Amino acid sequence: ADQLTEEQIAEFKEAFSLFDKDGDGTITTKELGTVMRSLGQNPTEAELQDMINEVDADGNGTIDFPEFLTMMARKMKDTDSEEEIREAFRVFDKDGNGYISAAELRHVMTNLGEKLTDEEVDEMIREADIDGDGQVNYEEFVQMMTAK
């Protein structure tokens, strides 16, 4: 069905090196500490150890390369891809940001051959903006069009 590409593994390899900040090869609680404090978090060495227990299937207090890739190579996120929401995002995203804005929608309805006033477009993006609000993304379009 789908063909995996070495590109994915390279992605997990870039994040791995970004975490280890001491040339070690293994991610400890100290290195990870600076990994969460340099991004946007201020937890502690104790709570951190707890977040490491789930990323440790041996009992060593650290993570290796086969555990970091086997954990993030499975799921990590959710990006449904169907022939329906695929063409839709391809026609609503002509700038590149990869997001549908109330403005673009206005220029898309007039091109197809219809006539919607700014009031109709803004109200539309609002009914589909359940988690974005102000902007829409892939997931939103997949959960706004399909619904029992």
Ligand X SMILES: NCCCCCCNS(=O)(=O)c1cccc2c(Cl)cccc12
| Residue 116 within binding range of ligand X, rule CB under 6 A | no
Tokens read off for 137:
């993304």
32 binds ligand X (CB under 6 A): yes
Q: How far is it, in rounded angstroms, from Cα 48 to Cα 58?
A: 17
Burial class (CB in 10 A: 0-12, 13-18, 19+), 32: buried
CB of 128 to ligand X, least distance (A): 3
Which long-range CB contacts under 8 A does 108-113 form with residues at least 24 apart?
Answer: none
Q: Does 11 bind ligand X (CB under 6 A)?
A: no
- Cα–Cα distance, 86 to 82 (Å, whole number): 6
To the question of whether residue 111 is assigned a binding role by annotation, the answer is no
Instruction: Please indicate if the annotation marks 122 as binding a ligand.
Output: no
Q: Say if residues 65 and 55 touch (Cβ distance below 8 Å).
A: no
Number of Cβ within a 10 Å radius of residue 13: 14
Q: Is 50 annotated as a binding residue?
A: no
Give the Cα separation of 23 and 62 in Å (integer): 15
Please give the residues from 82 up to 111 whose contact with ligand X meets the rule CB under 6 A.
Answer: 83-84, 87-88, 92, 100, 105
The site for Ca ion (CB under 5 A) is made up of 20, 22, 24, 56, 58, 60, 93, 95, 97, 129, 131-133
Check binding of 121 to ligand X (CB under 6 A).
no
Give the binding site for ligand X (CB under 6 A): 15, 19, 27, 32, 39, 51-52, 55, 63, 83-84, 87-88, 92, 100, 105, 124-125, 128, 136, 144-145
Q: Which residues are annotated as a binding site for Ca(2+)?
A: 20, 22, 24, 26, 31, 56, 58, 60, 62, 67, 93, 95, 97, 99, 104, 129, 131, 133, 135, 140
